[PDB]
Amino acid sequence: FQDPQERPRKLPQLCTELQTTIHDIILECVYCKQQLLRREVYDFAFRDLCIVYRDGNPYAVCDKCLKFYSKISEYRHYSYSLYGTTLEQQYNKPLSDLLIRCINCQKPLSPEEKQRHLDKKQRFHNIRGRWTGRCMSCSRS
Amino acid sequence: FQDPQERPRKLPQLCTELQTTIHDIILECVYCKQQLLRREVYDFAFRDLCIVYRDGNPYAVCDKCLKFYSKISEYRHYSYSLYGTTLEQQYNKPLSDLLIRCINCQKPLSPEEKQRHLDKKQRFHNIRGRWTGRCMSCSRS
Amino acid sequence: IDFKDVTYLTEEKVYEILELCREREDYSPLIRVIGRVFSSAEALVQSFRKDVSVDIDAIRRVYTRLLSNEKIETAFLNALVYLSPNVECDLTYHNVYSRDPNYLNLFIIVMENRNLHSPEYLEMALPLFCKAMSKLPLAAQGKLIRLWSKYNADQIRRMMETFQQLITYKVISNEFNSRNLVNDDDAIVAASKCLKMVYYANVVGGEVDTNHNEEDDEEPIPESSELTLQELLGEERRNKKGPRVDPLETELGVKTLDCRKPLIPFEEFINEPLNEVLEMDKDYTFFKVETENKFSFMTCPFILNAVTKNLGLYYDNRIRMYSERRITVLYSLVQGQQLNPYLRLKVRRDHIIDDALVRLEMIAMENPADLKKQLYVEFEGEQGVDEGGVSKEFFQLVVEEIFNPDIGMFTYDESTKLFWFNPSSFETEGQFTLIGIVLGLAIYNNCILDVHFPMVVYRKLMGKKGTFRDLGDSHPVLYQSLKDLLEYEGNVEDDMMITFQISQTDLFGNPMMYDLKENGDKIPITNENRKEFVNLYSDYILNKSVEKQFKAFRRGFHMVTNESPLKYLFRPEEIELLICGSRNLDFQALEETTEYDGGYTRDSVLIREFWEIVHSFTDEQKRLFLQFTTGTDRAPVGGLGKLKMIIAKNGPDTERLPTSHTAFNVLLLPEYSSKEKLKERLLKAITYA
Amino acid sequence: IDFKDVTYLTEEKVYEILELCREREDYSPLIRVIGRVFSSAEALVQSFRKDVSVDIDAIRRVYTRLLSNEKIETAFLNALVYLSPNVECDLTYHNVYSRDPNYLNLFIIVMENRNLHSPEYLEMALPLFCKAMSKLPLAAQGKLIRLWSKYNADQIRRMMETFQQLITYKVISNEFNSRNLVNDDDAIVAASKCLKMVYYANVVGGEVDTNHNEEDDEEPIPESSELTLQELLGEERRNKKGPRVDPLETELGVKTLDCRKPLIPFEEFINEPLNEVLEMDKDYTFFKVETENKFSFMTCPFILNAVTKNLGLYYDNRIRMYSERRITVLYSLVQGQQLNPYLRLKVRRDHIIDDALVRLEMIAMENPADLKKQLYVEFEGEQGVDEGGVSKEFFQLVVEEIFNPDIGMFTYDESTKLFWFNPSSFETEGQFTLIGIVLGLAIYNNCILDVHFPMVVYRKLMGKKGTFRDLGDSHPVLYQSLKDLLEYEGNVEDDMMITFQISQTDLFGNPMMYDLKENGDKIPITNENRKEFVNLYSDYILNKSVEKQFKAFRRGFHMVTNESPLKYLFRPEEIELLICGSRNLDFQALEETTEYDGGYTRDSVLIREFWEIVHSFTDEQKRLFLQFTTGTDRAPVGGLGKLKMIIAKNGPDTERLPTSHTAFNVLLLPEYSSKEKLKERLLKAITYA
Ligand SMILES: [Zn+2]
Ligand SMILES: [Zn+2]
Ligand SMILES: [Zn+2]
Ligand SMILES: [Zn+2]
């Protein structure tokens, strides 16, 4: 458990190792060190977050800790912002290819959200080199 | 000392009672209960603030307590705001006649500040029925 | 004859210039003199003369006499287009109304044109004329309103439609968004101002009841810091501080509360197309801080429907909460206090009423400004965070506990489903303040309630005493009895011997005897004093039988909503809709505004099955589902569409029932094997609560 | 002949159409063909052909041959006005440069007009042409810059004046305020872009020194929370994070640091009239968050003077401090930590250096993000609040303590008044990091300092190693000796026997011997290898004699200013002006910007006497007064006018000396009996410190 290459990174890949399914797996947060309920572990699987290991132990993140530390990182390491067309010109790679996550919930943006950003002319944000935007769930009033 | 009519209200009028001059009078704040230095007592005399009595004792206010509680009152009991011309039309009384104090330092506005508000079209504020504006000292960067 | 030297127009001249032109088939003199006299504003001041110097009947006669072809009608619109800027700038600058009161006489001449409703006036004439009317002085507006109040109901409706058609055309002919607004539009603002004039004319034209006014409520004492600050400034206590009232309201002297039954229903003045294009987030700011050109529409609340007035009230409450949070942060920073930006309300599930009562009493008697903070209810014995789910839970249980008939707090009438204040609730005042504060915090925090009160309760809350006409909703049997007594045309000293000595039953059953006058047993009811008996009996029943309890209830309610614009925006007939919710369950609207998350799409395999299942739901099952998900069985103010329901995918096909996150109206739906299994799980899940 | 069928212009045709028209006195064919070929953009692509396909000498010849009357000069401006929108939209949409590289050939043809400087081009032609040039692709800009770099110095100055005249005219011909800005103006933005192109051409046209580049600094490790978050996202360590660099900078491949001595001084490119009309508070926002139309001027820092670049840096630092305060508030709210929004630095008056060093070490090794908070220094033993007065006090005393020659930290050369790093400072690294962090926090908190360093120190700080040319400022005697050795035309193996075995003295006095090459005592200096000896000796002296100390100093300085745009805005020759201040004492400027409070007016009885007294002050007495009042004896960046001095009336005529509130540069002046008493009291007051 001391070689990172052997240790898995994704939630279902990790589940396959312990001979358990995502239905009734037990996981604990990395910041608050508390067990995740079913909702947050399923959200973790959906959001495609890599498992972090501390002293050779599996760890995930709960919704409160994730949404708090993402806000902290946004407030601290905000570099600048750019438009969708300008970002496309800078990277020359289609928007559906670049990995863009939500600022708050850290969920990767589906092409629908990127298109909505394009039409509504919302501004993509750069956070310590991590391009980001606003997802559908976090932009609902 | 239990009849308010006998007790004075203004700083020099109070000074005349105790056979002492404003030069070397001793006064203490009403909120923090600490003695005022020369600067704040002279500022109190300049700002035309009425002396408050607690259990038949003289009391003034220091700069920190005044500027803190005025900010609190502005944040709490803010009613609305109006333009100088609209205020003139509402009161039909010349701006130099109405008593307007600064929001922060509670200093009455000289006609110069009211004229500056008129030309720059700054907005007069209403705080629990007390009309107020921004003075020259508190609007300097 | 060309009539080149005419400066004023009277009834006979405008009649004698007709037969000659008709016989000589030359209508040019008519149109040229009309365009000459009408375009010159000063001419209308003296033309058609005799607190009104204009013979309205003669104006009507000449208007119906001249509006007979397709050419004369075109001679008025051009004259109006030429006149309106001149009159507008004249009133704006020269202050013409100050030098003479007969300058207003031209306004009625212009507005008596029965063809003003025609579509050709909405292009350039009517907007300019409405601008000129809106630029009029206050006293002239008051006297014009007084003159209009004497009109018949259909005439008032005609004026109302005349202005509403202009408003609808102006909002249809242009598009608005967050970039270009409707407030900055001058024509629509002027049209709304004249509509306000007409609405106040209608209000003052009906019955006015100012004598039966509730006593002024005692304004709560602010914190000691503000009192010390006021003492230091020397201002101390000032009576100037009061609610924001319309200048026209204080000029007329009659409030909208006094108008019981107006000539035209108040809902007619509500303009529909304007609301969907109007943004409250900027209108409230324009209302609070004056802007040079923008005009906030919350200054004329009648034009707003219940959906947007709720938005304005919510914005005001949210801004107050934000200011309270700022104050708490400032305290923690400067003074060094523990950051407590929430109204912590920790209560036990079994004794919610008493714990809430004692906590609210200790808060009110110590920190009256603490009630303006955001509510945060944390039940004792359970650990969690109330993001908006426990507060509504606490509201529902506190309503059930308070309105329990066991306590005897409120009498229950099954024939109407409307609780009434119990006069026998002696030595129990804290609970009435508790329920008043609960209602106030409910309005403040935007949480609907299941409260059934007669309209007289809300009328008394707004500041108008209950009267005989309001007894029908509260006591229909008593109202029927007293109206039968009033409508009896015979001698009431011969058939019944009912006097002012009136006895009523009690909750236990033993009746008690009450006296209305000094000695009611000695003075019987006669024909001449019958009228002054019902208005005293109903007055007693609605006012002084509950004099003590309702005073405390009103004080508790006003302790929270004293600074809110609720008293300014909402009439008593809308308070019950603001507090409670609509009882119509329309899931079709909920279909359109539902949002999906967790991987679910609109055209998903399980989403359609779920929608079919809920559409096939029974009337009571819909209520159960709504109560399970959103914490209440009533639709929000407006409709189900305003309830932004969210359905989130949970996980694979399991045996676990769906769970609901009540704070955000979020439903967690796993992907089940088929439709019938999902229906079974939903049925088993919504029935536990 | 009309020449109706010409599609391209060459040298002989534009020469043969001259004598015929001159002899036939008909200049119409010339102007008509000029307006035909020039207005058609495609014509210039092939006209006057041969990485440049245009014979520049032929273009110069034809331009001086045709610019000879008052009619031909008018045939170019109209053609330019017709061409420029077409070329602009062509480059914007059709992507013409992609299909061919010879489309750029028309730009040099247009810009070779020597009459472009004339005032008639500033109305409509030059702005449109500059817009078209600014709409050009990046590679074309790079090749145009490469072509321009070969021009002579006066030509580059001519282009610089050509664009600066347009900028000055455009800023003069229009007025700007907070309502209408200069960023949204398209013509001025295009002119600034072409000026940037010319400035980079000048930079790349001079000497380029890229080999003597300092090693890349180690980026400080962020807090453990951010590392955990990056691990969770799976991004971990990715090399996509770096300073914001100009796309033209990375396309050219040569930085402004490499250019030692440009053809034109960098201060010439600075535009004066633009700065007084430019607002940094909006320019910084337009620089950070991209706006659809507005163009921030901080993307071209050369056009800004030292006054406004300081404003931009201050705005960036203030925004970082505000974000840190927001983070602290969020921590206190959610997690429940004690609100600590200040960089608490409690030190003792006697041991400021050691206490500050240990506190800063324990902060940096634990919370690298804590250094970005606002400084708040509270001296031990005294009670008070540092609103901006104690921090500068701490800075001054820490400078005096660190730069004391007793510690031996820095060698002192009295002939230049410039401290130099001491190579003998062994086992002392923490103090160099301390002084670097002090300088960084000084730049961050906007507090000037009395620091005397040679320019080589700032050049090394920016990331460029010191060289032989920089030795003059540091070691003038050594520079003179080595330049005399270099300029010796004889045989250096015959007069002196100086070899690579070079010995130097020490602070104690005992010299030590140093070897430059492997065995310097065996290889003497000869004529052929003399050049490669001085560049190694000076390299050793400026780089590896202080290799250990300066590395720690640079690391400490960069720990604070890593995210600031200081590396992007300021050249090494402006860092010393940003940190230190101007030494010119101009009280006339201080007269205009002085403010009064407490009842004092501008035309007061005592104010004029005070101003006369201070104007009659001695050179050293002015410094003493400034140090007494504002806490420093140096003028701020810019002039005394930027120092918003405030004089406040204290009280009646007393015997108490005036006191100064250093946090706001406020002087408390009582109203004395006369002028001489005020002068005496001021003299007695400013001398205590
Ligand atoms: Zn956690
Ligand atoms: Zn999100
Ligand atoms: Zn105090
Ligand atoms: Zn002030």
Residue numbers in the entry:
A (entry chain B), B (entry chain D): 9 to 149
C (entry chain C), D (entry chain A): 120 to 169, 231 to 869
What do the study's own words say?
Human protein E6AP/UBE3A, the founding member of the HECT-type ubiquitin ligase family, was originally identified as an associated partner of the viral oncoprotein E6 of human papillomaviruses (HPVs). The E6 oncoprotein from high-risk HPV types hijacks the ligase activity of the host E6AP to ubiquitinate the tumor suppressor p5313, leading to the aberrant p53 degradation. The HECT-type E3 ligases have a characteristic C-terminal HECT domain consisting of an N-lobe and a C-lobe that are responsible for E2 binding and ubiquitin acceptance, respectively. Here, by using cryogenic electronic microscopy, we reveal that the structures of full-length E6AP and E6AP/E6 complex are monomer and dimer of E6AP/E6 protomer, respectively.
After several rounds of 3D classification, we identified five distinct conformational states of the E6AP/E6 complex and resolved the structures of these five conformations at resolutions ranging from 2.6 to 4.4 Å. We therefore assigned the five conformations into one of two classes: attached (Att) or detached (Det). In all three Att conformations, the catalytic C-lobe of E6AP attaches to E6, whereas, in the two Det conformations, there are no interactions between the C-lobe and E6. We hereafter refer to the three Att conformations as Att1, Att2 and Att3 based on the distance between the tips of the two towers in a descending sequence: 74 Å in Att1, 71 Å in Att2, and 66 Å in Att3. (1) the two towers tilt towards each other around a region of intersect between the two α1-helices. As such, the conformation of E6AP/E6 complex changes from Att1, through Att2 to Att3. (2) When the two towers leant beyond a threshold, the Att conformation changed into a Det conformation. While the distance between the two towers varies among the three Att conformations, there is no detectable difference in the distance between the C-lobe and the inter-protomer E6. As the two towers underwent an outwards rotation, the Det2 conformation transformed into the Det1 conformation. Intriguingly, despite substantial variation in the structure of the E6AP/E6 complex, the inter–α1-helical interaction remains intact; albeit there are some changes at the interface between the two α1-helices (238 Å2 for Att1, 222 Å2 for Att2, 209 Å2 for Att3, 157 Å2 for Det1 and 145 Å2 for Det2). The Det and Att conformations of the E6AP/E6 complex presented in this study should be structurally relevant to these accepting and donating processes, respectively.
